[PDB]
């Protein structure tokens, strides 16, 4: 799996 | 490995455009997560301006929004910024940034810009 | 925006001895099972490289005497011991929302 922010444009 | 390159004017007049150019190589522009410009202000402070993403989609800092502009070239492998109506205040170190997925925890994988370019420094003059 | 304050703003250190560097964020970057928060070291002419990411995690070829930790809205770096190629500029950055934030930096520098 993968963790890019809530908040990031292409969430 | 990969390597990132800023090329461009060094020398810019007020209210004209500047614009940069970052060429990748060793690693083609449409396999990174995502593909930014920061600029360092003389005094150290560093300004994220903004990226293109893989989908192509791009966001930019809310205070650069009205004038800036990143592109990509998938063939010349290259990323651009441009910035419009560039005031003193815009002279800065500039580089780009590839954001790519690090191993993380069990089997996981997190976003970080782990190669940045060496840099290019603009002086905004008339 | 998320802001990042570091402190303090320059620390003098000798050789040999242990550094710590905080990282507060005015609003928690924890989420879904990771802290949003990296670190990087820049040396003057040189473009910032990334130390820790994800709060904790050393990046390849960093040795281990860089240790990142923390959660929520508190981060720290810690160098111990500390060489003489560590004198640097060290940097927090955030990735939990766009815009992407950085903290003012604190400069490592030697004690003479």
């Known amino acids: 799996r993968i963790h890019i922010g809530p908040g990031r444009a292409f969430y | 490995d990969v390597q990132l390159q800023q090329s461009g004017p060094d020398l810019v007049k007020p209210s004209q455009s500047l614009s940069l150019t970052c060429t990748v190589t060793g690693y083609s522009i449409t396999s990174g997560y995502s593909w930014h410009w920061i600029r360092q202000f003389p005094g150290n402070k560093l300004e994220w301006m903004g990226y293109?993403?893989?989908?192509?989609?791009?966001n930019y800092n809310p205070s650069l929004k009205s004038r800036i502009s990143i592109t990509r070239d998938t063939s010349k492998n290259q990323f651009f910024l441009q910035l419009n109506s560039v005031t003193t205040e815009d002279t800065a170190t500039y580089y780009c940034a590839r954001e790519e997925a690090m191993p993380y925890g069990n089997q996981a994988y997190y976003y970080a810009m782990d190669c940045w370019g060496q840099g290019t420094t603009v002086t905004v003059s008339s | 925006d998320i802001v990042l304050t570091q402190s303090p703003a320059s620390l003098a250190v000798s050789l040999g001895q242990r550094a710590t560097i905080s990282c507060k964020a005015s609003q928690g970057v924890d989420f879904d099972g990771a802290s949003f928060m990296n670190w990087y070291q820049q040396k003057p002419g040189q473009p910032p490289k990334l130390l820790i990411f994800?709060?904790?995690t050393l990046e390849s070829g960093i040795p281990a005497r860089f240790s990142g930790r923390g959660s929520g809205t508190d981060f720290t770096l810690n160098i111990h011991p500390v060489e003489e190629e560590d004198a640097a500029t060290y940097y927090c950055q955030q990735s939990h929302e766009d815009p992407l934030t950085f903290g003012a930096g604190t400069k490592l520098e030697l004690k003479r």
């Open positions: 994800a709060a904790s």
């Open positions: 293109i993403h893989y989908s192509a989609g791009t």
